[PDB]
């Protein structure tokens, strides 16, 4: 099947001082956001109609409560332990926890913690594993959390029991949008001149779903190795934009075309020949 294969929740706890702390949460399906988190009410924002996906309102309320209690508890406990862990305000704590469905059937769960912009910890088989970037502080953190077995049991239960059946449920509940095929809108343009007597061949591709695409500058069947591909930049309404450039002379421009290969095109590719 096409589309996303992994569900995960992200956390961004910003600590300004020993009294101020702001947490930012959201649920994602690869690159597509399906949940929001209101830090004021301590509840979830279901962005899509199928965001609850086969889960009861009781279980959703149960899960929302666990996050609510954790978000406040963690922020408050970090402030109390900041002195011992030699923390310097301000700092940012990041977290990513979820599960992914791989080829063959296996659903593998994950949890990763971060301090600053670098890695801090990871949960491997319901145990705290400190990363080398975290140093002695991460070693001190994992040595402390291993003592609280119950917290690791909540982590284990949510990652290896709740997440796999939630992921499967939400992939079926939203297949109409996740497995959906959107035909890309492609057009050619001329960018800034890369030297006197030279042109910038720009090939724009926008509004395509799923994310896997193939764009190249062609002279018949020949693939031009000078094709400078951009980043898959996101759009609203769950679509993507990609720009492929090529530096060539004025005479070289004639006979060139832009080939676009996408899953929604059903074999017949978009070939845009250059016109002066």
């Amino acid at each position, epitope marked *: 099947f096409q589309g996303p294969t992994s569900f995960h929740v992200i956390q961004t706890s910003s600590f300004t001082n020993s009294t101020w702390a702001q947490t930012q949460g959201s649920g994602w399906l690869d690159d597509l956001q399906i949940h929001g988190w209101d830090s004021d009410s301590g509840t979830a924002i279901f962005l899509k109609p199928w965001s609850k996906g086969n889960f009861s309102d009781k279980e959703v309320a149960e899960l929302e*409560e666990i996050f*609510r*209690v954790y978000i*406040f508890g963690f922020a408050r406990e970090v402030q109390d332990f900041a002195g011992d862990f030699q923390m310097k305000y301000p700092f940012e704590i990041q977290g990513i926890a979820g599960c992914e469905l791989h080829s063959g059937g296996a659903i593998v769960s994950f949890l990763r913690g971060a301090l600053g912009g670098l890695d801090f910890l990871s949960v491997k088989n319901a145990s705290c594993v400190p990363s080398p970037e975290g140093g002695s502080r991460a070693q001190k953190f994992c040595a402390l959390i291993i003592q609280y077995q*119950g917290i690791m*049991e909540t982590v284990r*239960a949510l990652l290896y*029991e709740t997440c796999p059946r939630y992921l499967l449920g939400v992939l079926n509940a939203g297949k109409a949008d996740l497995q959906r095929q959107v035909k890309p809108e492609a057009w050619l343009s001329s960018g800034p001149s890369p030297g006197p007597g030279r042109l910038q061949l720009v090939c724009h591709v926008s509004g395509f779903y799923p994310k896997p695409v193939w764009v190249m500058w062609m002279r018949g069947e020949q693939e031009q190795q000078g094709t400078q591909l951009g980043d898959i930049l996101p759009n609203a309404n769950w679509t993507w934009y990609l720009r492929a450039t090529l530096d060539v002379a004025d005479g070289e421009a004639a006979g060139l075309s832009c080939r676009v290969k996408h899953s929604s095109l059903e074999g017949q590719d978009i070939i845009l020949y250059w016109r002066g």
Partner: T-cell receptor
Amino acid sequence: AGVTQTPKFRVLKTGQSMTLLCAQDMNHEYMYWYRQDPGMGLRLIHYSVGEGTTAKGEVPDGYNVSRLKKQNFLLGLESAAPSQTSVYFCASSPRLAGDEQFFGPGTRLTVLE
Amino acid sequence: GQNIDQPTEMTATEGAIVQINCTYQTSGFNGLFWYQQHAGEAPTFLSYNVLDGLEEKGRFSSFLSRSKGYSYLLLKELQMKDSASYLCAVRNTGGFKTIFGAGTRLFVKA
């Protein structure tokens, strides 16, 4: 005993109102209100995870709860019924490393017609 | 953990050994607890088991088996003060809510 319960015993008329006070001086974040009936056993009425918030347990009808201070969790009956004739126990545990619920002495309530 | 089964009553001779068995069914385990409750006082914390199996403290022992979904509470060299109700509890994921069993009334013969 580090958890206080007021009153110890109470007799009410069907329709009367009363308020049970649970006081704790351990600086515990989580507080609970239970009711014990012949096995059956302990049934959670309401619980508070913080000073502001409060949440429903197994049997939250028709009980009212309030948390204004981290040390006090108040249970309230607004219109007593003979069904609410039970032994009420309140308990508290910390947010971190607890693992142990500290129970109050208990309140024996009897609602008569 | 929500479904908890344990015996209603148990009678034992003073100075002997008693074993209160408890069988449970979880939809998410977070710990197994044992509580002592005298008539008609409040429940007292006795033991906490998060992993298999045995835990010791004084004359009391508590074993847990998450794989076989059961737990037992051992009462070594029994005394008269041990005559009370023994509650078997299972905590839900994660932390706050704890589900209590019906209890086991232990009668100690002098």
